[PDB]
Amino acid sequence: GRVKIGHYILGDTLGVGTFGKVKVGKHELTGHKVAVKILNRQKIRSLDVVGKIRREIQNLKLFRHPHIIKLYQVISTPSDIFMVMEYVSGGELFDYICKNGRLDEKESRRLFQQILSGVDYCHRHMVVHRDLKPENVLLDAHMNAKIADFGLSNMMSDGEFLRTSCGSPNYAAPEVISGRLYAGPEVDIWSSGVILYALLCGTLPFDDDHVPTLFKKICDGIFYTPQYLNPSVISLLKHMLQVDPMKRATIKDIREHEWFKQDLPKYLFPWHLGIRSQSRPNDIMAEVCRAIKQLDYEWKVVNPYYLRVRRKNPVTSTFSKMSLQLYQVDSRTYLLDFRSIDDERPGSHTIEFFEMCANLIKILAQ
Amino acid sequence: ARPTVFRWTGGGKEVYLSGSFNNWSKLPLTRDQNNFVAILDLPEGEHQYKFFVDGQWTHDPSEPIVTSQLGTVNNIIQVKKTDFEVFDALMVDSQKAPPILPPHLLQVILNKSCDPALLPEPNHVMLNHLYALSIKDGVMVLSATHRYKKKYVTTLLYKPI
Amino acid sequence: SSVYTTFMKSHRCYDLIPTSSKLVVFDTSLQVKKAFFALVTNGVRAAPLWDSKKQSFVGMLTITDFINILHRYYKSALVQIYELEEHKIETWREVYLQPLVCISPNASLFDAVSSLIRNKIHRLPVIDPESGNTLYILTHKRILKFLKLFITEFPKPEFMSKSLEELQIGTYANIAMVRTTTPVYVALGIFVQHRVSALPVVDEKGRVVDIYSKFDVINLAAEKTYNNLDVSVTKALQHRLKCYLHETLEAIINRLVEAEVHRLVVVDEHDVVKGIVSLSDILQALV
Ligand SMILES: Nc1ncnc2c1ncn2[C@@H]1O[C@H](COP(=O)(O)O)[C@@H](O)[C@H]1O
Ligand SMILES: [Cl-]
Ligand SMILES: [Cl-]
Ligand SMILES: [Cl-]
């Protein structure tokens, strides 16, 4: 009376995962092995991580890339939620680097092209696997890289940033460790940047046993480059490991890079914002809400610096919405940004937004 | 196949599971690492069970009980239809200073000799955002890039104020 | 029902919408001089109008509007055109023509060409029925540029081989032409009363030296030189093609698209021309 989910006899626990226990499943009849994430409904009920697990399920569902661990099925029982996935014999790329040495230039690149390939597919689907590390990059029998924990992944939205500063300290981007909000893919490039370092060197580019000093190292963007390293790869790392996101390499910038280009298999790839006010951030919110009330617009308060304002069209009798988020530019200045909230016909949505916005600017400060 | 995992987060050398679903017969729980486990496919409905933990019968006090008219205390499980749809099962489980301006909202596609009515593919992150020109001869110029399907359109409103 | 008719009937307007474009909208309340300046400073031959009070796009502002204002209200080179300098768009639209023609992105290119000829227009706003907003402005040039892609790869029918003369495409009767000495004011006049887009400029000798067009007129706005229209058409063109009757429709189409021009002067044996063929006529003859 051995534990099994259908014809898959469950075996050894290969890991604990971001969410649930990952066990092996060798098929009773065919001997086919699968990896099974067991999300215990007794533990998932507990938090509001219920969303963070519906996010992993939903994202991963439609994917099918050669270097992303495949989701075969997701089966729900009263007890738990099982996620049947493709199983690989090689385990952690991390343990491979530990056990074997640093990877040779040829091998380092081979594996890097694969990890970047998967990472590209992800972004191309507006999915961003925050928490990219060799611990989450698995190897198969002929050691092809396979991306694996989409628990800390997230769906990129049109006109929206993301805060959740997640992932292992070493592999976490300066803006992540800093807590500042990012677009998404910059972050995965900075992680893929350290992965390449670990590949060619066998060590980490930013490391310290004291966490805050490590955080400073990461933000200083300064790391060692051994003599054995090729200057061309050094230049690529210099670009991926840029502290400023606006100066940091893009997947395109990497595809364009000569080091990355060498022996690449073809199967892998195919005016100013808002109004700025120098007033007190609380006083700005105060100034805005008495101006919103003036325009008779309805609204709801999310964050103290975030408002969702609605407006009944006096002519077409239809509703128009916008997101008002206060930011901070200088050490002395503050900026108010107007984003459109696309509803779901008699008069244009786009122009109705401009009108709603202009009506406010007509009275507000600088 | 949708089997229900029974767990025994207790101690013990030998643990068994007796249920209505197996006609009150001692089914052995396999010691995982932490708990003693068994996985059985149980149909939609009410099911009572108990545990034989080291020659002593008990319910899991953690799990719901049911006391009979006869004095027997058994555990109980309601296997609902909701317990099978992955997203339906997800819903049933539910029950200081302003941020620093991200650098991506400073890059304007209107700012940066082909078509004058032709612009580059904008970064998704600035779609729906309001960028306005300084108020001139009593005229305020407003712009926003929006996407319709695989196409992007930067609309410019020339509005007197 | 030619192959092109069935080709245009198959393709959505959306297909012609570029990957990332600019769209300039004017509120009807905006000053009319500002409106024209904006067309120039943004680099766009036209812009849709928005009535904020009516909460709908009530029309379009083109160079044709400038040509009609600039002519109706030009008192002299000594007195500034008051009306233009102090009119709103809504006040001028009240003067002229005392409704907005558009198309859905999910509508055929056939319905788009049909609309252009049927409504006797050059600009066609593509407006989304779902959102209610204008996405792109469909021009004859864009439509023919794309149709060209089809006929270069697809085998040419018998009528494409035939001559412009024997096919009878384009206006050849009562062709409005200007002279070298003709002033800009007279030129605008002809544009207004003859409803034409361009006027060929003949020499004192009689050979066509140049060509004045609705587009040339915007340089008056651009170079802020509009206040004197007494200047000869040649003096105006100081800021800065042909075809024969006997030529094939194919050869003619290739020239119109390559040159990226809106018409071709149709010459006889000599410098002096027998008529004019336009993109409108080419597109009407393929739909
Ligand atoms: N100079 C001209 N004289 C007479 N008809 C013209 C002239 N230029 C264009 N047309 C005609 O005007 C119609 C519409 O063309 P267009 O206004 O040029 O887009 C066509 O039938 C043209 O042949
Ligand atoms: Cl682990
Ligand atoms: Cl085995
Ligand atoms: Cl394998």
PDB file of C-alpha atoms in Angstrom, chain A residues 129-340:
ATOM      1  CA  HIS A 129      10.805  34.704 -12.907  1.00  0.00           C
ATOM      2  CA  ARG A 130      12.259  36.824 -10.117  1.00  0.00           C
ATOM      3  CA  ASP A 131      14.652  34.424  -8.118  1.00  0.00           C
ATOM      4  CA  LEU A 132      16.851  33.181 -10.997  1.00  0.00           C
ATOM      5  CA  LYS A 133      19.826  31.239  -9.387  1.00  0.00           C
ATOM      6  CA  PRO A 134      21.926  28.062 -10.253  1.00  0.00           C
ATOM      7  CA  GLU A 135      19.972  26.444  -7.337  1.00  0.00           C
ATOM      8  CA  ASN A 136      16.809  26.904  -9.557  1.00  0.00           C
ATOM      9  CA  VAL A 137      18.533  25.928 -12.826  1.00  0.00           C
ATOM     10  CA  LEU A 138      18.370  22.160 -13.268  1.00  0.00           C
ATOM     11  CA  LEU A 139      20.383  19.813 -15.525  1.00  0.00           C
ATOM     12  CA  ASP A 140      19.127  16.820 -17.491  1.00  0.00           C
ATOM     13  CA  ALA A 141      21.022  13.588 -18.381  1.00  0.00           C
ATOM     14  CA  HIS A 142      22.976  15.338 -21.273  1.00  0.00           C
ATOM     15  CA  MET A 143      22.969  18.499 -19.092  1.00  0.00           C
ATOM     16  CA  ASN A 144      20.676  20.985 -20.853  1.00  0.00           C
ATOM     17  CA  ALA A 145      19.681  23.833 -18.491  1.00  0.00           C
ATOM     18  CA  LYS A 146      16.060  23.859 -17.225  1.00  0.00           C
ATOM     19  CA  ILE A 147      14.486  26.859 -15.365  1.00  0.00           C
ATOM     20  CA  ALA A 148      12.416  25.626 -12.330  1.00  0.00           C
ATOM     21  CA  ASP A 149      10.848  27.751  -9.531  1.00  0.00           C
ATOM     22  CA  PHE A 150       8.104  30.049 -10.808  1.00  0.00           C
ATOM     23  CA  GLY A 151       6.745  30.664  -7.267  1.00  0.00           C
ATOM     24  CA  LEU A 152       8.481  34.033  -7.109  1.00  0.00           C
ATOM     25  CA  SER A 153       7.620  34.755 -10.784  1.00  0.00           C
ATOM     26  CA  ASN A 154       5.062  37.512 -11.772  1.00  0.00           C
ATOM     27  CA  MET A 155       2.928  38.682 -14.742  1.00  0.00           C
ATOM     28  CA  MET A 156       4.059  42.061 -16.278  1.00  0.00           C
ATOM     29  CA  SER A 157       1.230  44.546 -16.801  1.00  0.00           C
ATOM     30  CA  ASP A 158       0.742  47.246 -19.468  1.00  0.00           C
ATOM     31  CA  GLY A 159       1.768  50.536 -17.842  1.00  0.00           C
ATOM     32  CA  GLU A 160       2.626  48.925 -14.454  1.00  0.00           C
ATOM     33  CA  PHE A 161       5.772  48.284 -12.340  1.00  0.00           C
ATOM     34  CA  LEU A 162       6.384  45.634  -9.595  1.00  0.00           C
ATOM     35  CA  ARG A 163       7.634  46.010  -5.939  1.00  0.00           C
ATOM     36  CA  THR A 164       7.985  42.534  -4.254  1.00  0.00           C
ATOM     37  CA  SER A 165      11.726  42.580  -3.555  1.00  0.00           C
ATOM     38  CA  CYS A 166      12.293  38.823  -3.787  1.00  0.00           C
ATOM     39  CA  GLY A 167      15.053  36.265  -4.535  1.00  0.00           C
ATOM     40  CA  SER A 168      18.353  35.237  -2.875  1.00  0.00           C
ATOM     41  CA  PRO A 169      20.462  38.236  -1.721  1.00  0.00           C
ATOM     42  CA  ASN A 170      23.471  37.459  -4.003  1.00  0.00           C
ATOM     43  CA  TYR A 171      21.369  36.998  -7.198  1.00  0.00           C
ATOM     44  CA  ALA A 172      19.004  39.973  -6.345  1.00  0.00           C
ATOM     45  CA  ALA A 173      19.393  43.188  -8.487  1.00  0.00           C
ATOM     46  CA  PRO A 174      20.435  46.543  -6.830  1.00  0.00           C
ATOM     47  CA  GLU A 175      16.888  48.040  -7.238  1.00  0.00           C
ATOM     48  CA  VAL A 176      15.427  44.819  -5.692  1.00  0.00           C
ATOM     49  CA  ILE A 177      17.690  44.836  -2.583  1.00  0.00           C
ATOM     50  CA  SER A 178      17.048  48.623  -2.428  1.00  0.00           C
ATOM     51  CA  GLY A 179      13.256  48.050  -2.427  1.00  0.00           C
ATOM     52  CA  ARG A 180      12.661  50.493  -5.352  1.00  0.00           C
ATOM     53  CA  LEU A 181       9.981  49.400  -7.940  1.00  0.00           C
ATOM     54  CA  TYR A 182      11.168  47.897 -11.285  1.00  0.00           C
ATOM     55  CA  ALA A 183       9.680  47.035 -14.694  1.00  0.00           C
ATOM     56  CA  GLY A 184      10.587  43.352 -14.508  1.00  0.00           C
ATOM     57  CA  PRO A 185      13.113  42.001 -17.058  1.00  0.00           C
ATOM     58  CA  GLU A 186      16.081  44.274 -15.960  1.00  0.00           C
ATOM     59  CA  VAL A 187      16.031  42.254 -12.728  1.00  0.00           C
ATOM     60  CA  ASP A 188      16.287  38.795 -14.502  1.00  0.00           C
ATOM     61  CA  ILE A 189      19.200  40.087 -16.613  1.00  0.00           C
ATOM     62  CA  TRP A 190      21.092  41.057 -13.390  1.00  0.00           C
ATOM     63  CA  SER A 191      20.381  37.582 -11.996  1.00  0.00           C
ATOM     64  CA  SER A 192      21.470  35.914 -15.309  1.00  0.00           C
ATOM     65  CA  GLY A 193      24.541  38.146 -14.997  1.00  0.00           C
ATOM     66  CA  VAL A 194      25.657  36.586 -11.703  1.00  0.00           C
ATOM     67  CA  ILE A 195      24.703  33.050 -13.049  1.00  0.00           C
ATOM     68  CA  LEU A 196      27.306  33.605 -15.829  1.00  0.00           C
ATOM     69  CA  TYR A 197      29.854  34.740 -13.257  1.00  0.00           C
ATOM     70  CA  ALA A 198      29.243  31.602 -11.159  1.00  0.00           C
ATOM     71  CA  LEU A 199      29.541  29.540 -14.422  1.00  0.00           C
ATOM     72  CA  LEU A 200      32.969  30.938 -15.517  1.00  0.00           C
ATOM     73  CA  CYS A 201      34.363  31.377 -11.995  1.00  0.00           C
ATOM     74  CA  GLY A 202      32.764  28.857  -9.676  1.00  0.00           C
ATOM     75  CA  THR A 203      32.396  31.726  -7.090  1.00  0.00           C
ATOM     76  CA  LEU A 204      29.911  34.633  -6.592  1.00  0.00           C
ATOM     77  CA  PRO A 205      30.588  38.196  -7.848  1.00  0.00           C
ATOM     78  CA  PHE A 206      29.103  39.814  -4.731  1.00  0.00           C
ATOM     79  CA  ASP A 207      29.613  37.900  -1.505  1.00  0.00           C
ATOM     80  CA  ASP A 208      29.930  38.562   2.201  1.00  0.00           C
ATOM     81  CA  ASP A 209      28.872  36.678   5.343  1.00  0.00           C
ATOM     82  CA  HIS A 210      27.603  40.005   6.810  1.00  0.00           C
ATOM     83  CA  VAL A 211      24.361  40.724   4.944  1.00  0.00           C
ATOM     84  CA  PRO A 212      24.414  44.624   4.996  1.00  0.00           C
ATOM     85  CA  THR A 213      28.068  44.744   3.712  1.00  0.00           C
ATOM     86  CA  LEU A 214      27.083  42.368   0.865  1.00  0.00           C
ATOM     87  CA  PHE A 215      24.121  44.758   0.074  1.00  0.00           C
ATOM     88  CA  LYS A 216      26.658  47.597  -0.256  1.00  0.00           C
ATOM     89  CA  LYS A 217      28.888  45.415  -2.583  1.00  0.00           C
ATOM     90  CA  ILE A 218      25.835  44.677  -4.840  1.00  0.00           C
ATOM     91  CA  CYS A 219      24.918  48.387  -4.960  1.00  0.00           C
ATOM     92  CA  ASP A 220      28.537  49.430  -5.612  1.00  0.00           C
ATOM     93  CA  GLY A 221      28.426  47.130  -8.688  1.00  0.00           C
ATOM     94  CA  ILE A 222      32.123  46.389  -8.217  1.00  0.00           C
ATOM     95  CA  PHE A 223      33.265  42.708  -8.435  1.00  0.00           C
ATOM     96  CA  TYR A 224      36.478  40.713  -9.195  1.00  0.00           C
ATOM     97  CA  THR A 225      37.505  39.603 -12.688  1.00  0.00           C
ATOM     98  CA  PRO A 226      40.086  36.724 -12.625  1.00  0.00           C
ATOM     99  CA  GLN A 227      42.969  36.712 -15.220  1.00  0.00           C
ATOM    100  CA  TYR A 228      41.580  33.408 -16.699  1.00  0.00           C
ATOM    101  CA  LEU A 229      38.465  35.370 -17.820  1.00  0.00           C
ATOM    102  CA  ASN A 230      38.179  36.385 -21.534  1.00  0.00           C
ATOM    103  CA  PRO A 231      37.988  40.265 -21.945  1.00  0.00           C
ATOM    104  CA  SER A 232      34.967  39.851 -24.235  1.00  0.00           C
ATOM    105  CA  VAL A 233      32.988  38.000 -21.558  1.00  0.00           C
ATOM    106  CA  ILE A 234      34.210  40.573 -18.972  1.00  0.00           C
ATOM    107  CA  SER A 235      32.655  43.320 -21.143  1.00  0.00           C
ATOM    108  CA  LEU A 236      29.330  41.393 -21.331  1.00  0.00           C
ATOM    109  CA  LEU A 237      29.286  40.961 -17.501  1.00  0.00           C
ATOM    110  CA  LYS A 238      30.168  44.682 -17.163  1.00  0.00           C
ATOM    111  CA  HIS A 239      26.908  45.367 -19.149  1.00  0.00           C
ATOM    112  CA  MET A 240      24.553  42.869 -17.486  1.00  0.00           C
ATOM    113  CA  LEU A 241      25.854  43.861 -14.022  1.00  0.00           C
ATOM    114  CA  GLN A 242      25.242  47.605 -14.428  1.00  0.00           C
ATOM    115  CA  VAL A 243      23.905  49.156 -11.177  1.00  0.00           C
ATOM    116  CA  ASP A 244      21.747  51.704 -13.051  1.00  0.00           C
ATOM    117  CA  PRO A 245      18.883  49.834 -14.841  1.00  0.00           C
ATOM    118  CA  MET A 246      18.847  52.401 -17.705  1.00  0.00           C
ATOM    119  CA  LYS A 247      22.468  51.464 -18.515  1.00  0.00           C
ATOM    120  CA  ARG A 248      21.994  47.693 -18.009  1.00  0.00           C
ATOM    121  CA  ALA A 249      22.177  45.221 -20.909  1.00  0.00           C
ATOM    122  CA  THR A 250      18.987  44.041 -22.614  1.00  0.00           C
ATOM    123  CA  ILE A 251      18.465  40.533 -24.069  1.00  0.00           C
ATOM    124  CA  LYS A 252      18.948  42.300 -27.478  1.00  0.00           C
ATOM    125  CA  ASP A 253      22.204  43.905 -26.230  1.00  0.00           C
ATOM    126  CA  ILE A 254      23.342  40.306 -25.288  1.00  0.00           C
ATOM    127  CA  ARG A 255      22.130  38.670 -28.550  1.00  0.00           C
ATOM    128  CA  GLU A 256      24.153  41.474 -30.327  1.00  0.00           C
ATOM    129  CA  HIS A 257      27.217  40.607 -28.132  1.00  0.00           C
ATOM    130  CA  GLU A 258      30.082  38.719 -29.906  1.00  0.00           C
ATOM    131  CA  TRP A 259      30.859  36.412 -26.963  1.00  0.00           C
ATOM    132  CA  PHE A 260      27.189  35.333 -26.746  1.00  0.00           C
ATOM    133  CA  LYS A 261      26.998  35.027 -30.601  1.00  0.00           C
ATOM    134  CA  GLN A 262      29.894  32.464 -30.968  1.00  0.00           C
ATOM    135  CA  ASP A 263      28.611  28.891 -31.714  1.00  0.00           C
ATOM    136  CA  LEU A 264      24.928  29.855 -31.069  1.00  0.00           C
ATOM    137  CA  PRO A 265      22.409  27.111 -31.999  1.00  0.00           C
ATOM    138  CA  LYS A 266      19.567  28.463 -34.121  1.00  0.00           C
ATOM    139  CA  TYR A 267      16.818  26.542 -32.158  1.00  0.00           C
ATOM    140  CA  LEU A 268      17.278  28.887 -29.156  1.00  0.00           C
ATOM    141  CA  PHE A 269      15.995  32.179 -30.652  1.00  0.00           C
ATOM    142  CA  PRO A 270      13.772  33.460 -33.568  1.00  0.00           C
ATOM    143  CA  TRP A 271       7.426  66.741 -23.106  1.00  0.00           C
ATOM    144  CA  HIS A 272       7.341  65.496 -19.467  1.00  0.00           C
ATOM    145  CA  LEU A 273       5.497  63.040 -17.178  1.00  0.00           C
ATOM    146  CA  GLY A 274       2.629  64.437 -15.029  1.00  0.00           C
ATOM    147  CA  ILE A 275       2.877  67.509 -12.758  1.00  0.00           C
ATOM    148  CA  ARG A 276       5.729  68.009 -10.233  1.00  0.00           C
ATOM    149  CA  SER A 277       5.052  69.679  -6.805  1.00  0.00           C
ATOM    150  CA  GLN A 278       7.724  70.665  -4.230  1.00  0.00           C
ATOM    151  CA  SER A 279       4.995  70.691  -1.440  1.00  0.00           C
ATOM    152  CA  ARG A 280       4.643  68.127   1.452  1.00  0.00           C
ATOM    153  CA  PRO A 281       3.554  64.634   0.216  1.00  0.00           C
ATOM    154  CA  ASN A 282       0.586  64.649   2.634  1.00  0.00           C
ATOM    155  CA  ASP A 283      -0.262  68.282   1.567  1.00  0.00           C
ATOM    156  CA  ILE A 284      -0.102  67.227  -2.141  1.00  0.00           C
ATOM    157  CA  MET A 285      -2.654  64.389  -1.502  1.00  0.00           C
ATOM    158  CA  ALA A 286      -4.708  66.952   0.428  1.00  0.00           C
ATOM    159  CA  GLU A 287      -4.435  69.536  -2.475  1.00  0.00           C
ATOM    160  CA  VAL A 288      -5.438  66.797  -5.048  1.00  0.00           C
ATOM    161  CA  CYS A 289      -8.488  65.358  -3.205  1.00  0.00           C
ATOM    162  CA  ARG A 290     -10.080  68.805  -2.709  1.00  0.00           C
ATOM    163  CA  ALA A 291      -9.451  69.398  -6.456  1.00  0.00           C
ATOM    164  CA  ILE A 292     -11.001  65.948  -7.361  1.00  0.00           C
ATOM    165  CA  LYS A 293     -14.074  66.889  -5.190  1.00  0.00           C
ATOM    166  CA  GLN A 294     -14.228  70.252  -7.087  1.00  0.00           C
ATOM    167  CA  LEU A 295     -14.537  68.341 -10.401  1.00  0.00           C
ATOM    168  CA  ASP A 296     -17.338  66.196  -8.711  1.00  0.00           C
ATOM    169  CA  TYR A 297     -15.325  63.015  -9.612  1.00  0.00           C
ATOM    170  CA  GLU A 298     -15.750  59.958  -7.370  1.00  0.00           C
ATOM    171  CA  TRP A 299     -12.606  58.131  -6.094  1.00  0.00           C
ATOM    172  CA  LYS A 300     -11.223  55.344  -3.848  1.00  0.00           C
ATOM    173  CA  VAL A 301      -7.984  55.458  -1.733  1.00  0.00           C
ATOM    174  CA  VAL A 302      -5.613  52.438  -2.110  1.00  0.00           C
ATOM    175  CA  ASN A 303      -2.196  53.533  -0.656  1.00  0.00           C
ATOM    176  CA  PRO A 304      -2.034  57.036   0.967  1.00  0.00           C
ATOM    177  CA  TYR A 305      -0.123  57.966  -2.255  1.00  0.00           C
ATOM    178  CA  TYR A 306      -2.445  55.992  -4.623  1.00  0.00           C
ATOM    179  CA  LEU A 307      -6.040  56.969  -5.685  1.00  0.00           C
ATOM    180  CA  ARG A 308      -8.488  55.325  -8.182  1.00  0.00           C
ATOM    181  CA  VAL A 309     -10.691  58.194  -9.539  1.00  0.00           C
ATOM    182  CA  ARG A 310     -13.952  57.579 -11.538  1.00  0.00           C
ATOM    183  CA  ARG A 311     -16.073  60.058 -13.612  1.00  0.00           C
ATOM    184  CA  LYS A 312     -19.643  59.855 -14.952  1.00  0.00           C
ATOM    185  CA  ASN A 313     -19.697  61.374 -18.455  1.00  0.00           C
ATOM    186  CA  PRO A 314     -22.277  64.196 -18.319  1.00  0.00           C
ATOM    187  CA  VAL A 315     -23.008  63.680 -22.099  1.00  0.00           C
ATOM    188  CA  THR A 316     -22.503  59.987 -23.124  1.00  0.00           C
ATOM    189  CA  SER A 317     -23.517  58.734 -19.575  1.00  0.00           C
ATOM    190  CA  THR A 318     -20.452  56.380 -19.384  1.00  0.00           C
ATOM    191  CA  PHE A 319     -17.696  55.839 -16.783  1.00  0.00           C
ATOM    192  CA  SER A 320     -13.997  56.810 -17.228  1.00  0.00           C
ATOM    193  CA  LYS A 321     -11.212  55.923 -14.687  1.00  0.00           C
ATOM    194  CA  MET A 322      -7.507  56.800 -13.904  1.00  0.00           C
ATOM    195  CA  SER A 323      -4.709  55.822 -11.401  1.00  0.00           C
ATOM    196  CA  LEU A 324      -3.053  58.732  -9.487  1.00  0.00           C
ATOM    197  CA  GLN A 325       0.280  57.706  -7.885  1.00  0.00           C
ATOM    198  CA  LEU A 326       2.636  60.165  -6.188  1.00  0.00           C
ATOM    199  CA  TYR A 327       6.382  59.535  -6.650  1.00  0.00           C
ATOM    200  CA  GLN A 328       9.532  61.356  -5.484  1.00  0.00           C
ATOM    201  CA  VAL A 329      12.036  62.678  -8.045  1.00  0.00           C
ATOM    202  CA  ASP A 330      14.559  64.825  -6.084  1.00  0.00           C
ATOM    203  CA  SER A 331      15.499  64.936  -2.420  1.00  0.00           C
ATOM    204  CA  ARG A 332      13.235  68.078  -2.503  1.00  0.00           C
ATOM    205  CA  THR A 333      10.786  67.401  -5.414  1.00  0.00           C
ATOM    206  CA  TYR A 334       7.676  65.095  -5.823  1.00  0.00           C
ATOM    207  CA  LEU A 335       5.897  63.964  -9.061  1.00  0.00           C
ATOM    208  CA  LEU A 336       2.210  63.014  -9.616  1.00  0.00           C
ATOM    209  CA  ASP A 337       1.571  60.435 -12.372  1.00  0.00           C
ATOM    210  CA  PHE A 338      -1.717  59.806 -14.253  1.00  0.00           C
ATOM    211  CA  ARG A 339      -2.235  56.252 -15.659  1.00  0.00           C
ATOM    212  CA  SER A 340      -5.344  55.140 -17.634  1.00  0.00           C
TER     213      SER A 340
END
